[PDB]
C-alpha cells in the first residue's frame, strides 16, 4: 500500500565505499522500473531489460573503469575483494557519474577500496576489516613493514581526472515463499 522507496537509495546525498557497500531491503510496496529506466549503465541480467518476493538495493561508489566488474563472471580487485555478483545473478546494475558530488580539489580520500585479501569474496559478502595484510611468511602484528600492508587504498577523486578514474555511483538491484514487492 506504499510507494517503494527507490529515491532513498538513488538520490541519497551520501554513498558508501565499495568495501563498505550498503544494502536496503525493498518490500511491502509498489515498484515501477520504466520510471527508473540519466544513467550511464542500466543492464538487466536473468530478466529482460525491455520487459519477485524481495528486492535488495546495494549502493556504493567505484571508478568508471571498474563498472564492468559489477557483472556476473567478472574478475578484478572490486569483484575479487569488494563486491561480488553471483554467476547465476538475476537483477539490474545501474551506474552514473558523480564527479560533481564525489570529487574534490586535492582529492576526496573518503572513498576507499580493498586491494588485498587472502580469499576472493563469496557472492554478496562484505569485508569491513582494516587489519594489516600479510603478503609473506613473516608475521605483521598490526604493524606495517615488509610483507605488511594496510589492505585499503584511496580513490583520491580529483575533478580534472579522466572519466575512467572519475567517481561512479552504482546501485545493484538483486531480485529474490509469498511476495511483498509487486510491479503495479
Amino acid at each position, epitope marked *: 500500500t506504499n510507494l517503494c522507496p527507490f529515491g532513498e537509495v538513488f538520490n541519497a546525498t551520501r554513498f558508501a565505499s565499495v568495501y563498505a557497500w550498503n544494502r536496503k531491503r525493498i518490500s511491502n510496496c509498489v515498484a515501477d522500473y520504466s520510471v527508473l529506466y540519466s544513467f550511464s549503465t542500466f543492464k538487466c541480467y536473468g530478466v529482460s531489460p525491455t520487459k519477485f518476493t524481495n528486492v535488495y538495493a546495494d549502493s556504493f561508489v567505484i571508478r568508471g573503469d571498474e563498472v564492468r566488474q559489477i557483472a556476473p563472471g567478472q574478475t578484478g580487485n572490486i569483484a575479487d575483494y569488494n563486491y561480488k555478483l553471483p554467476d547465476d545473478f538475476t537483477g539490474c546494475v545501474i551506474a552514473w557519474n558523480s564527479n560533481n558530488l564525489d570529487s574534490k580539489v586535492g582529492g576526496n580520500y573518503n572513498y576507499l577500496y580493498r586491494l588485498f585479501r587472502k580469499s576472493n569474496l563469496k557472492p554478496f559478502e562484505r569485508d569491513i576489516s582494516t587489519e594489516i595484510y600479510q*603478503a*609473506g*611468511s*613473516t*608475521p605483521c*602484528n598490526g604493524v606495517k*613493514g*615488509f*610483507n605488511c*600492508y594496510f589492505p585499503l587504498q584511496s580513490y583520491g577523486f580529483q575533478p580534472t581526472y579522466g572519466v575512467g578514474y572519475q567517481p561512479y555511483r552504482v546501485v545493484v538491484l538483486s531480485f529474490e515463499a509469498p511476495a511483498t514487492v509487486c510491479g503495479p
Partner: antibody
Amino acid sequence: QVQLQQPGTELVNPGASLKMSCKTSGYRFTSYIIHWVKQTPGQGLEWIGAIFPENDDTSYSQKFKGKATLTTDTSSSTAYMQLSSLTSEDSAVYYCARDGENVLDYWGQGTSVTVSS
Amino acid sequence: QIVLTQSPSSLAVSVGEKVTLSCKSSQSLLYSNNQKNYLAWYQQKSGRSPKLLLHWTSTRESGVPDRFTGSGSGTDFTLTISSVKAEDLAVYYCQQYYTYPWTFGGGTKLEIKR
C-alpha cells in the same frame, strides 16, 4: 606448474655489473614475494634479499645493501637482481625462490656466475 | 639479525640409525598470537636446489618421508630422521622467517658410514 626459471650461467668481466633474471610461471606474480639466495661452492646458503612484485618494496641483508638491487617487470612476470663491481667473491650460484604458505617451496635451478676476463 | 647456529657441521651415521640435527636461535622464533615457531628446514642434495622438508618447525611438506620430523620451541629446534637411508645424504639447513633480515644456518652435512 609453478616454475621459476633462471639463466644457467653468466660469464662477467671483473669490475663489471650483471643483471640476472627469474622468469615466473603458474601463479599471479604480484601476489607472491621473490627471495634471492647465494651459495659459494662448498659453502652454505646466504639470504641476499626479497622483493614484493606489487609495490617493489625490498628487504636486504646488511652485506648486500649497495651490492644487490632487486627489480621487477610485471608484464614479463620476471624478477631481476643486479650486482655491482663484480669481484672473485661474487663468483657463486645465485638462487631465486618464491615465498608461499609453505615458505620457500619453489626454487629455481640456479644461475652460476663466473667472474673472469 | 637473528643468528642460527647448527651443531654439528658434519656427522657420519650408519644406515638405520636415528639422527638428531640442531638449530639454536639468538632470539625466540615463537609468535605469541598463533603460538607457532617461525623456522623452516631444507635439504640440499649434491648438485641440486634446496628442498623444503618442514615449515613452522613440525609441518612436513607433501612427499616428504615420515622419517623426517621437526620439534622445538623458542631458541632450540631439532630435525630428527628415524632410520636414515643412504639417499638421506645431504646438507640440511635451518631458516628463520620470524623477522627480516631472513637468516639461514651453516648447515649439517650428513655423511653415511659403510
